[PDB]
Symmetry: C2
Subunit: 295 residues, 2 copies
Amino acid sequence: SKKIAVIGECMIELSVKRGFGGDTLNTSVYIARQVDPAALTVHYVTALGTDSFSQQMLDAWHGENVDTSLTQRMENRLPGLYYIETFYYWRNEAAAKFWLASEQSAAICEELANFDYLYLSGISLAILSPTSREKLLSLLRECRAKGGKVIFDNNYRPRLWASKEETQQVYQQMLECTDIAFLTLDDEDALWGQQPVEDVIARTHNAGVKEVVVKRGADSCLVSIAGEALVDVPAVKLPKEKVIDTTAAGDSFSAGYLAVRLTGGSAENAAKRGHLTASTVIQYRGAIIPREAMP
Amino acid sequence: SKKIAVIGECMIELSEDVKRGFGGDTLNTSVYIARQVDPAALTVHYVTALGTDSFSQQMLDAWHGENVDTSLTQRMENRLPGLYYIETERTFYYWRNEAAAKFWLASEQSAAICEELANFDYLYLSGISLAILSPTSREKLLSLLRECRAKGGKVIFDNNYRPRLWASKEETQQVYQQMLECTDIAFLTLDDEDALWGQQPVEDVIARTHNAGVKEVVVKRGADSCLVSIAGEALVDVPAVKLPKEKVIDTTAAGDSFSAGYLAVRLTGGSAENAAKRGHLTASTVIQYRGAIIPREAMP
């Protein structure tokens, strides 16, 4: 079997109902829902507190067959919290920010260096200190040196960074450590200024990235593999009335794409699955849709 | 009319069905004073800082609806209110460490708001109001209190002690000592004094507090009687009217509502004894309801 570790943060979510939500955790759940665990196991890597909100999260994740054995619990921290009306965040002291700055960080990183795949988003980098970002980048390099592959989702939240220049510098270091990049085009527009998709693709290959997957909302997905012709796969047009909530469209697309791509499927079939997944998700309220209990 | 400014923090409150409201020790007190005084005799001003968000807005409107004036409360672009979460036997969870309220003395309106406050008849704050401020901000506040008193204002302190908000017991001790050297009326919850300074006879709690300079010491003893000691005068000792224990639903806000009831009377010409009676009456009613702020209709 192969193993993927998904690194980032999941918060307490308020919308009045209470759940949980985080871009990378959403992605982890959709991968786990779609793969044969004999082919690929999904590990979420974060930190939480020893409180009962953290517990309820861990429990639900185990119910989704997401392995949390590399997630840490920190006695004097809580999860971050966000509220949906507009988003409001109470996340600047989250346990998740500190997973690379504890006494257990080292052993966890030695375990992760041996993983087949490591995945993280722009948010996963944003929440780390400059020093923790360095440690994470070194882990990625070590994993790749051992034959592992690094996947990055460019999910861009300017409010989490000190400046546009800081994000650019950190994304540049990240792309130089990346094998597969998921780039939401609007996010590349926002971060780097508006540029033709061909230049977005080119500069990303120039950073060293072999496989660049460009997500374009309702426009088609472009997959560019260095030295190969472009793959162009249209989305699953739904009538307007079936679209209820576009939250997690992007995160679930990355999930569907990897469920296929990391179990032997073509880039075209991986894109088809990303589109099918995102299309399903947007027809139900909430980031995480009801599990298919009986397929 | 006289003006009292009440200074501290009100947070976004979640309680779990899951409901959203707002709560904070000094805000609860402000609301309870505002519910019981003649606006011609005494106006109530809450002094804090909030966000520009709609949570801050729902708070401001709600307080306006209670006749609390918010003109000296700041709205901060890049900050949100603190937020807390109650799970119900209750557990409390906090996300309060970047709340706007922490920074009201570190802004560009700070000096000018303080200039208005220096001229007020009464300034009131609690130990929580002090805990959330940086050392530098605490010093400016203490400076404001001195200026106010030199102008003939009176300073009122509620010792509400929350050790989680402080760096150390030593730090709390130092800042309380400084506060009490600047205080005219001190509401001392006796369990808080025991926790902060070690268990000592109530007579010594009273004496040391007079010794620090405080003229009127009001000791809250939960179900036990209220003791009011005014320097140079015999002790005043006022029991609550006994309440059947099954009617006690939620002791939340008991102490904050007692201070409010006391001040609604004491600051409008009433005796220490009637002020204590109204403290007890207010607290008695309050604890018979779920939530810090009971319904207007429920009031004494």
